[PDB]
């Protein structure tokens, strides 16, 4: 729970094991699927890793509600504390 240099940092790194992306792409604003290309059905992997790593809680409805990785952070920081 700190703010976006934990979140993206992180969340691009469950985007490297999850698909194989490179710890830059995934910035904010990346549309993570289809900019980044990760497997859709992996990306809910993902967001569950995501949360349990940044300490928020993403459920399902906001899961699909983030299609980026700008939406991602900007839920998660705001939602973590």
Excluded: C, W
């Excluded at 194989?20 to 980044?36: A, Q, R």
């Amino acid at each position: 729970a700190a703010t976006q240099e934990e979140i993206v940092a992180g969340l691009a790194e469950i985007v490297n094991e999850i698909a194989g992306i490179p710890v830059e792409d995934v910035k904010l604003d990346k549309s993570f699927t289809d900019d980044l290309d990760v497997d859709s059905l992996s990306m809910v992997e993902v967001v569950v890793a995501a949360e349990e790593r940044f300490d928020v809680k993403i459920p399902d409805d906001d899961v699909k509600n983030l299609k980026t990785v700008g939406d991602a952070t900007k839920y998660i920081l705001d939602h973590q504390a």
